[PDB]
Amino acid sequence: FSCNVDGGSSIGAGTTSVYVNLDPVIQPGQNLVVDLSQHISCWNDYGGWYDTDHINLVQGSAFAGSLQSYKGSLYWNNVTYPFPLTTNTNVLDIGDKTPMPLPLKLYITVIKAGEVIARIHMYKIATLGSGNPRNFTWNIISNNSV
């Protein structure tokens, strides 16, 4: 199983920074959209749904630093969850070789350029053998002040 960020080099596990351009101005009560689907893409490494990868986001995924106290929501594979995550999400299944934009959006209801605003833990386990489970962490960093 593999992922990449902004067409970058392949990622098999670990921590990766994900950089987003946000609307630099808001009135409170109006929520911000962080579409991560535009930055993170993932695919199956063999294809044909031969050894299907099973992906979900993990309990403990939360806002970081500046936004720690904020409440928000997280959209994942056709389902919306309260954010920070208090449970695991539904499972997204990936078996094609053509990169798939992660169906992941973060909504947040005072951001400084270059800070980590969310840390999203993602779990992977496949179907065949042990499934060779892997963990991913996406540290979401705002490319502009907001």
Ligand SMILES: CC(=O)N[C@@H]1[C@@H](O[C@@H]2O[C@H](CO)[C@H](O)[C@H](O)[C@H]2O)[C@@H](O)[C@@H](CO)O[C@@H]1O
């Ligand atoms: C251990 C490992 O990463 N092997 C690489 C293969 O990874 C496998 O990919 C399938 C489908 O995604 C599934 O995730 C397995 O659990 C995983 O091990 C694969 O990337 C191949 C591609 O040539 O290289 C290694 O063998």
